[PDB]
Design a protein around this ligand. Structure first.
Ligand SMILES: [Mg+2]
Ligand SMILES: [Mn+2]
Ligand SMILES: [Mn+2]
Length: 272
């Protein structure tokens, strides 16, 4: 079955509605699959603070997410985290790497999220997540993920400095036009799999786009990844960064697309 964990505490959020988007996503999953989420953290307003300030402010939420994710990863269920920001994964990815040293992390994101304190232009913690989990800088929440076990999927238009950090560390990049289900399967080989998704990977949703080549990933491409990873190899899934207000029609439509993308994996886990 499925363990649902939901972050509702601020972790460096610079957008207004990502805590609300996580709540609405969790509600849709609860209703579809008959679950009750474990909600962690207290909402706080978004701000443009430096990572050196936002990171300590988030410690209580990050520690609580780490503890809940550890219990779930140690048990027998599919671990599903619905997170306001990618930065929640500074707490979860070190657990995955410790418990499953052979796991491959598919980090599905329009960005590389691979800046360090030395290379960030904006100071935003959310742009430093994968590099922190891989130990290029010290988040205070551990590291241990081998860059050789991390695969960026859907990333594009990466700053040339950050792209070479990625290359030197050994992180593979599969851009949207290469991100077929088989390309992702070939990257994972026989490994167990952790899937992390930032919804900014998606092509902006003017779906009447039959005569133009998309720059982002299409929902069908994400669905095809969830269809291809064998249920017995899937460790867990993190869904992050839906920026949509509570009670908006926009959030209603967004979560319907999300449920369609994740259904192959979640349906299998609920039937395990
Ligand atoms: Mg499991
Ligand atoms: Mn991200
Ligand atoms: Mn992103």
């Amino acid at each position: 079955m499925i363990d649902l964990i939901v972050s509702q505490g601020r972790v460096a959020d610079r957008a207004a509605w990502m805590i609300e988007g996580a709540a609405r996503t969790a509600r849709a999953l609860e209703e579809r699959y008959g679950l009750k989420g474990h909600y962690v953290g207290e909402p706080a307003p978004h701000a443009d603070d430096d990572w050196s300030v936002a990171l300590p402010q988030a410690r209580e939420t990050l520690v609580a997410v780490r503890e809940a994710a550890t219990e779930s990863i140690k048990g027998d269920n599919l671990t599903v985290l619905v997170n306001n920001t990618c930065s929640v994964s500074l707490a979860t990815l070190p657990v995955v790497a410790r418990e499953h040293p052979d796991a491959v992390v598919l980090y599905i994101d329009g960005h590389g999220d691979f800046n360090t304190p030395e290379t960030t232009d904006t100071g935003y913690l959310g742009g430093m997540v994968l590099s922190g989990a891989c130990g290029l800088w010290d988040s205070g929440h551990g590291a241990g993920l081998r860059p050789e076990q991390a695969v960026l999927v859907g990333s594009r238009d990466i700053d040339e400095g950050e792209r070479e950090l990625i290359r030197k560390a050994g992180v593979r990049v599969i851009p949207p036009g290469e991100a077929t289900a088989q390309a992702v399967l070939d990257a994972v080989k026989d490994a167990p799999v952790w899937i992390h998704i930032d919804w900014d990977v998606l092509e902006p949703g003017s779906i009447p786009a039959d005569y133009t080549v998309p720059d982002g990933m299409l929902p069908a491409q994400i669905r095809a990844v969830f269809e291809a990873i064998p249920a017995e190899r899937l460790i867990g899934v993190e869904l992050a960064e839906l920026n949509a207000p509570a009670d908006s029609e926009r959030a209603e439509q967004a979560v319907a697309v999300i449920l369609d993308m994740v259904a192959p994996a979640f349906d299998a886990a609920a039937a395990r």
